[PDB]
């Protein structure tokens, strides 16, 4: 086959669906493609999302894709004595959600289709087409044939593997090993947890990362570990760390697992360039996961919006120059560069701390409930009460 579009979006996760929806709202003839036969499945995510992005992206919170609302987050040190608690000043209100990521991704893809985007599933991009000095489309497998899709702008939202950008020639997205987290997670049922809180566990129990417990309601939880690949050798060792943690927590040990997933998370500083003429990378493909939290859902949605915005300006003025592409890079840097620099420095330092030091830090920060739901609020409390451990972040908090 052959096709002509204004915009081709490679990938049907939250980043791609967001880019495609906004491109279509912006009047552009848009195709979104997804490699997998089903949008959203299988789920390879903790499904944790802070509340604000749904408002920012104009997505209505619906129970069909929200498993559980949480009132706060708790962060435990190695001895699990008293946790840092982050929760709103107001009595009842929710700070975030644990999603059904599959239903969420389907909902976002449906918003894209409603806005006017075409959507292909079981339709991987195979490689990149260039012409007249710009990325000009992709070869795509669709219904057992190779289709040549020409587009004025390609938005690559193809996840952690970031194939399209690599094929196109962007070296900036190649990660150093110290910025790669190997993650492993069980979906558990019949566990005894507190569905008001997403819990995070720090220490040598999860080297150079953390263990999390995200409740879904009705005795279900996502229970995972993430560790920098330079610390935990292989995935069987990673699984052993998580299993030991579960064994040592009676409320988790009594449950059953129904799913086991693995995946990679980037924890890098912002990477430039993430464009070339005709091409913008979004979400995980652009290495926009938060270096301290490992969260990328919100950042994929934000970057998809920004990519669609600049794509509109590019097509309406037929200006695909590096200077035009750099407007997208400017939005990304303004939103994320300083935050991710701070967070990258923080995670590099945190990886070197002993269990005793972590216990001390959590003891100090957990003296007051934090009512600003942010990493910045945690870092500032450390900067103030325990400046010794955060001297490296001096200019950055
Ligand atoms: C174990 C684990 C737990 C996590 N926990 C959280 C969490 O709780 N909260 C959070 O915010 N973040 C979490 N993350 C990160 C989060 O899941 C991602 O940041 C998020 O999915 C990024 O969205 P995206 O659209 O950029 O990428 P993706 O959701 O990965 O979507 C990219 C899509 O591109 C498709 N694709 C790939 N190659 C091609 C190709 N050649 N052609 C066409 N399509 C292609 C893929 O099939 C995929 O559907 C977690 C990650 C892991 C691995
Ligand atoms: C001594 C204590 C040190 C703390 C260590 C950190 C540990 C746990 C993080 C809990 C943070 C709770 C919070 O405030 O959440 C939201 C953001 O959304 C989230 O944090 C939810 C994302 C959940 C992602 C799960 C990813 C699982 C995969 C791998 C895990 C390993 C990753 C390891 C990274 C390296 C870390 C050592 C608000 O953030 P802010 O985006 O910052 O909100 C403000 C913004 O408006 C902009 O300023």
From Swiss-Prot:
It is found in: Cell membrane. Pathway: Membrane lipid metabolism; glycerophospholipid metabolism. One of its GO terms (molecular function) is NAD binding. A 2,3-bis-O-(geranylgeranyl)-sn-glycerol 1-phospholipid binds at residues 339, 375. Is involved in the reduction of 2,3-digeranylgeranylglycerophospholipids (unsaturated archaeols) into 2,3-diphytanylglycerophospholipids (saturated archaeols) in the biosynthesis of archaeal membrane lipids. Catalyzes the formation of archaetidic acid (2,3-di-O-phytanyl-sn-glyceryl phosphate) from 2,3-di-O-geranylgeranylglyceryl phosphate (DGGGP) via the hydrogenation of each double bond of the isoprenoid chains. Can use both NADH and NADPH as electron donors. Reduction reaction proceeds via syn addition of hydrogen for double bonds. This is Digeranylgeranylglycerophospholipid reductase. It comes from Thermoplasma acidophilum (strain ATCC 25905 / DSM 1728 / JCM 9062 / NBRC 15155 / AMRC-C165).
